[PDB]
Symmetry: C3
């Protein structure tokens, strides 16, 4: 009964793995072998050519342009005034993008409100693995954010930043040629 369903789900896992290996030389989570990355993206209203893994969470008002790659284990949170992301962006695995915060709410024992502020990222941006972007941040166009960064403030166009907190290292012109 339930054990038949389990056994069938196990068979589907083995077969879908064999399929993903042969056709796309990859092995993916079960969820990612049911759900299609391009269809999910369409269904959420993102630009054509944009893709999003099953493992990604998308909250509230989020806009994404064309040909933007949204990686696995990502967070796109537009619950706090909307998140807007541009075209041709790389949103690496484990990148988290926020428009709200609950620090005061926790530290006050549940009394204080949630803090909220909108966030926007331009086009032709690269957000390295495990980048955290906090609420109220504006990122310009043609920006590189290195892996593991924590972005607490606006970044101008054509900049490379990294660190916790992220600081401006230099321009990103080299990556554009």
């Amino acid at each position: 009964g339930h054990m038949i369903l389990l056994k069938e789900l196990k068979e589907l896992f083995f077969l879908r793995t064999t399929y993903y290996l042969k056709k796309y030389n990859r092995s993916l989570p079960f969820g990612d072998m049911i759900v299609d990355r391009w269809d999910k993206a369409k269904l959420l209203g993102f630009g054509e050519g944009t893709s999003i893994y099953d493992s990604s969470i998308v909250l509230g008002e989020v806009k994404v342009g064309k040909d933007t790659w949204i990686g696995p284990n990502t967070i796109l949170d537009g619950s706090g005034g909307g998140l807007i992301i541009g075209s041709n962006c790389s949103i690496s695995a484990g990148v988290q993008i926020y428009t709200h915060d609950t620090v005061r709410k926790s530290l006050s024992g549940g009394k204080a409100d949630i803090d909220k502020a909108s966030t926007r990222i331009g086009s032709d941006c690269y957000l390295g693995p495990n980048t955290i972007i906090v609420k109220g941040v504006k990122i310009g166009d043609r920006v590189v954010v290195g892996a593991n960064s924590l972005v607490l403030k606006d970044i101008p166009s054509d900049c490379k930043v990294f660190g916790s907190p992220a600081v401006i290292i230099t321009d990103s012109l080299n990556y554009q040629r």
Copy 2:
């Protein structure tokens, strides 16, 4: 035959649940989080009232959580090496990993050493920011702020703010508690 019919059925369920979650709760979740409810999972694991935990969270060994605590996606709660306690009104951000064991010696010795173990505790009224890592043996008090991207290697007293890898005390946390 049935393999592909089940796939179709799962695909149809996914489309219907996504469409549903988009209109009611204004969000799109992983397949797993559309079968498994965050509140029911918390209730089942014995957690306090109003506590919630995503399907993607891993809970190993002895783990207890108080009330009104938010356990985020892609989290690790590892009580396997002597018990993990987390208090009430806590924010456990996405990607936060909390441990009571590790395997460094096991690996480095070619599989011969034991797993090392130590219980871990977090108080009430704490905030652990995205991708915070808490290692075995840590005791965190009440009303602590741990900033994003931190690696906490030692006990943190109540009413403190820390961040960094490894985390250091930056100042007290009293200003965050106000009304």
Copy 3:
């Protein structure tokens, strides 16, 4: 159909959680209570005793030795000329290991090619939570990489490193 399948998937979740809690003292994501970590590893061609969570992604050519533990929320990317990993390694939760990168492709508006370089990790290595290893890196044997690290350069055998970026701290002889 749809209501029903939903209802049965829920029932199965409750029943599997109950069984995992009693038998292995754990609660796991839905997908990790379908997929067995040792079977998935075997199917992927990994060595005997290796395990990998459902939540892991493996791209391209990836070779993994015996008795290597591959944790949840991991990325093993061998798409840019192969990733090789040795025996008895701990690949903690959140670790991402790459052989490709798309910085130029994004920053050029989709014009530039994907950059590629093979990556290698020896045996008896520990990679701490959320370690990021970039393309082209060679990690020796018996290396410790501390949590929250970004590995941008080679690491010799018997070394301990950590940081973003990762720097050498000392030898790893104490852990052996």
